[PDB]
Design a protein around this ligand. Structure first.
Ligand SMILES: Cc1cc2nc3c(=O)[nH]c(=O)nc-3n(C[C@H](O)[C@@H](O)[C@@H](O)COP(=O)(O)OP(=O)(O)OC[C@H]3O[C@@H](n4cnc5c(N)ncnc54)[C@H](O)[C@@H]3O)c2cc1C
Ligand code: HEM
Ligand code: HEM
Ligand code: HEM
Ligand code: HEM
Ligand SMILES: O=C(O)/C=C/C(=O)O
Ligand code: NA
Length: 568
């Protein structure tokens, strides 16, 4: 067969997958994916038949219920979504090579000739609030608005939910939480504000950072009340104390939080539409929002009438062309992001009159796996790993901020470095097992053997770990002044992970005030238009602290959904 539908229709009718009238149920292909499930079973049942030792197309880290049509199209060959970051040995029937080619918002002007027709028609739906983006900010705003009594529509352009938020690892920063007190940590909203402003080089909008710190415990409480486990508190870079919350054992915060949020939207019957891209915010004659034009992948353009539109579309760190324009030193770097994190959401915000700020501040994550091409969480250092160069020596304070860690790693021989840790570090952070399963954490019972495996000076590496361990026992790092030395690397086996910097987060974005209201260049609110999440600028200044983005999207998503519901 040339395609999946063709293959099935040799022995089945069209209505085995389609509805009685044959029209597509919706842009999420709800009905249609139900029929795939009907015969092949759920994704977990399918996963039993496609097992590989360390990977499985149908059993991944993605949260929510991943539709089969995310990767299997019927009437045409389709792409494996995992190929956008990994290069697993897959044999999906009717596959084609991963290639992301999505028209920009500007390029969609060519659809003038279908957009006017959609805009001339009646709204397809009339609701109170449309949320754009199913990342942590978007679900948060959707839930919060719904909880406040607003009727919401939540759209996501991708086939899967979660954006970059589902990939988060190290934690969600928050101060003075019950979770911290349980672990004997002393912190305060004031110290979090201080660490943040300093980490952002005091560029951050003080009012936004005050919302960030002061709502942080409340956001942790709200997540936990919805079912989140944020009881593990770890250290991340540039933080005076451990304040990055994540599930028991050091599991990734991201997939968990998004799963909680998705479960919570589902419980509230939130109208969630996949493969639906927000294209244009619609304003009435007084310039207040009156809705949004969307482009449903399967059903075309249509508009939704609504009082408020909350843009929660995330950053543009996957868009290296846009990135390089603003920061030519990041040209050609690999990104840690999901494939649609390209800044189309910012273009929508700008076309609606929203002004942008701090766009030139683009954060590179210092430790992408060279081998796997994926982020390796900063919690690996925060839990006690060190960085060594090819010469087998330390070269930076591993818990300094991301801009300084990146530059120090890029200055080492070969422009990469190695995370080194033992089994005590590995056991304190279950996420590390994920790197081991990926094949990117080679191991050996001695550092001479580890270094010989990876091309690291073995006996210098041994001297390096012995010296670091005596600094840990002394209590002070006189070589690089790492302020927190939580463990000695001296338990069990040793592991090395080759790392180099990758493009990760865009701190700039649309200007919002403390109620998450989008502002124009004159600093005037655009009535009904809200922004929440990495799409906004001004929260993180020149350099975001690790763990501050999950804190940001919950706080600001939640706040935007409440403010939009009340605006009404
Ligand atoms: C690999 C990784 C690990 C990280 N770990 C952490 C961590 O541990 N702590 C921390 O603080 N930060 C962390 N960060 C950053 C953090 O994840 C966030 O920046 C991300 O959660 C921002 O959430 P968001 O809701 O703003 O956007 P995202 O989660 O990116 O979600 C936005 C959604 O909008 C959808 N969308 C975009 N444009 C449109 C459009 N026009 N129409 C419709 N839908 C649209 C996008 O496809 C996306 O799904 C990490 C980031 C990454 C990539
Ligand atoms: C879009 C919806 C569906 C998806 C994504 C899907 C997935 C697939 C794939 C990938 C294959 C293997 C293709 C190949 O070997 O070339 C397959 C085969 C098959 N499918 Fe589907 N399917 C869907 C709908 C259905 C439905 C509705 C039925 C039954 C009415 C069904 C029953 C089968 C059967 C019987 C086979 C052959 C192998 C077997 O005996 O299980 N599928 N399907
Ligand atoms: C000859 C039998 C079939 C006919 C005439 C038919 C008709 C169509 C049409 C007209 C569309 C596009 C509708 C639009 O764009 O609004 C479509 C899409 C779709 N059909 Fe079918 N269909 C048939 C069989 C199947 C089968 C067997 C499957 C699944 C195994 C299937 C699953 C889907 C899906 C998932 C879509 C959405 C887009 C895509 O994945 O290609 N159809 N079909
Ligand atoms: C319940 C949802 C889905 C159904 C019913 C379905 C159906 C199937 C079937 C029947 C096969 C052939 C495996 C076999 O020989 O038994 C298969 C293979 C495959 N599917 Fe799915 N699929 C689903 C979701 C997905 C998703 C969401 C993705 C990507 C994230 C995906 C990617 C693949 C790949 C890459 C293969 C080849 C497996 C390998 O080479 O290990 N599928 N699918
Ligand atoms: C359904 C699609 C995917 C599958 C089946 C898959 C598979 C895997 C596997 C097998 C691992 C090693 C640990 C584990 O077993 O979980 C892994 C790790 C990882 N993958 Fe994926 N992957 C998928 C999509 C993606 C995409 C598109 C990205 C980036 C946007 C990504 C980012 C990562 C990262 C950052 C890690 C490191 C460990 C962690 O953070 O948990 N994955 N993935
Ligand atoms: O876990 C990490 O490395 C990323 C943290 C962050 O971006 O805040
Ligand atoms: Na931003």
């Amino acid at each position: 067969a040339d395609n999946l539908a063709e293959f099935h229709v040799q022995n089945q009718e069209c209505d085995s997958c389609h509805t009685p009238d044959g029209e597509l149920s919706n842009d999420s292909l709800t009905y249609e994916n139900t029929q795939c499930v009907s015969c092949h079973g759920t994704l977990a049942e399918v996963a039993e038949t496609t097992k590989h030792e360390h990977y499985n197309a149908h059993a991944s880290h993605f949260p929510g219920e991943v539709a089969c049509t995310s990767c299997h199209s019927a009437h045409e060959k389709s792409m494996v979504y995992c190929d956008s970051c990994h290069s697993f040995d897959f044999n999906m029937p009717y596959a084609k090579k991963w290639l992301r080619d999505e028209p920009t918002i500007a390029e969609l002007a060519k659809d003038k000739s279908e957009r006017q027709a959609a805009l001339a028609s009646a709204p397809h739906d009339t609701v109170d609030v449309v949320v754009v983006g199913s990342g942590g900010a978007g679900f948060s705003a959707a839930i919060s608005a719904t909880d406040s009594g607003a009727k919401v529509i939540l759209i996501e352009k991708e086939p899967v939910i979660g954006g970059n938020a589902k990939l988060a690892a190290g934690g969600m920063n928050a101060a003075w939480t019950d979770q911290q007190k349980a672990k004997k940590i002393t912190d305060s909203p004031e110290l979090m504000f201080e660490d943040t402003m300093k980490g952002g080089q005091n560029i951050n909008d003080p009012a936004l950072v005050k919302v960030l710190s002061s709502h942080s415990k409340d956001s942790v409480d709200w997540m936990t009340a919805m079912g989140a486990d944020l009881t593990d508190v770890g250290m991340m870079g540039g933080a005076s104390v451990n304040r990055a919350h994540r599930p028991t054992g050091g599991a990734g915060v991201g997939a968990h939080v998004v799963q909680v949020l998705y479960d919570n939207a589902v419980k509230r019957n939130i109208d969630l539409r996949m493969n639906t891209r927000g294209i244009e915010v619609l304003k009435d004659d007084k310039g207040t929002v009156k809705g949004i034009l969307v482009k449903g992948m399967y059903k075309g353009y249509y508009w939704v009438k609504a009082d408020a539109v909350i843009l929660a579309t995330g950053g543009f760190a996957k868009n290296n062309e846009r990135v390089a324009k603003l920061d030519p030193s990041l040209k050609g770097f690999i990104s840690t992001n999901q494939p649609g994190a390209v800044g189309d959401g910012l273009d929508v915000a700008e076309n609606a009159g929203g002004a942008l700020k701090d766009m030139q501040y683009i954060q590179a994550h210092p430790t992408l796996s060279v081998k796997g091409g994926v982020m390796v969480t900063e919690a690996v250092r925060g839990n006690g790993a060190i960085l060594v160069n090819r010469e087998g020596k330390r070269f930076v304070n591993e818990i300094t901020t991301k801009d300084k860690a990146s530059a120090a790693i890029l200055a080492q021989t070969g422009k990469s470095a190695y995370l080194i840790f033992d089994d005590s570090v590995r056991k304190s952070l279950s996420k590390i097992d994920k790197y081991i399963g990926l094949g990117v954490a080679p191991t050996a019972d001695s550092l001479v053997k580890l270094g010989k495996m990876e091309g690291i000076d073995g006996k210098a590496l041994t001297e390096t770990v012995a010296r670091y361990n005596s600094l840990v026992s002394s209590g002070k790092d006189t070589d690089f002044e790492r302020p927190n030395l939580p463990r000695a690397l001296n338990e069990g086996n040793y592991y090395a992970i080759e790392v180099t910097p990758g493009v990760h987060h865009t701190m700039g974005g649309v200007m919002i005030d403390t109620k998450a209201e989008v502002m124009n260049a004159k600093k005037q609110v655009i009535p009904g238009l809200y922004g929440a999440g990495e799409v906004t600028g001004g929260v993180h200044g020149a350099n975001r602290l690790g763990g501050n983005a999950i804190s940001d999207i919950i706080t600001f998503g939640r706040l935007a959904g409440e403010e939009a519901a009340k605006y009404s």
